[PDB]
Write a protein that binds this ligand. Sequence first.
Ligand SMILES: [Zn+2]
Ligand SMILES: [Zn+2]
Length: 83
Amino acid sequence: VANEETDTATFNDDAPSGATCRICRGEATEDNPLFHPCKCRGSIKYMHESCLLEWVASKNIDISKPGADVKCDICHYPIQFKT
Ligand SMILES: [Zn+2]
Ligand SMILES: [Zn+2]
């Protein structure tokens, strides 16, 4: 379903009980949760694993190469998608 112009979301100034993405305000799942790859902080730090993979792609950077420095512009922290 994608005909609407709004959807349910969560916003707070501490660790949310139902945290949501910074790209599509979805709430963590059982296959694609949420996590903060960066130090943007607040309610726009979280992101789905998919959403991050599409974000760093829009930034015009090859995350599969050792010739990159894939990171933010809000807080400028190096983005993290593995540990
Ligand atoms: Zn998302
Ligand atoms: Zn950031």
